[PDB]
Amino acid sequence: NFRVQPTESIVRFPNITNLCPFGEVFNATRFASVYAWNRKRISNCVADYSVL
């Protein structure tokens, strides 16, 4: 077929300025026990593991 190469790379993500709670999750003071383990919903943030 007649191939049209992409002109430019477009990136579209949901804008948000908040970093995800890497401190409240990984740096938290005391985790729950394994039998009853805390499940924290991570939503409406930016997940960046460079901060870790």
Q: Supply the minimum distance, in Å, between the C-beta of residue 10 and ligand NAG.
A: 12
Q: Pick from ligand NAG, a second copy, none: which does 34 bind, CB < 5 to 8 A by kind?
A: a second copy
CB-nearer residue toward ligand NAG: 34 or 52: 52
Stretch that binds ligand NAG, among 1-9, 21-29, 36-44 (CB under 6 A): 21-29
At closest approach, how far in Å is the CB of 30 from a second copy? 7
Nearby residues of 44 by Cβ (< 8 Å), 6 or more positions away: 16, 18
Q: Residue 23: which of 44, 2, 40, 5 has the closest Cα? A: 40
Q: Measured between alpha carbons, how far is 52 from 28 in angstroms, rounded to an integer? A: 13
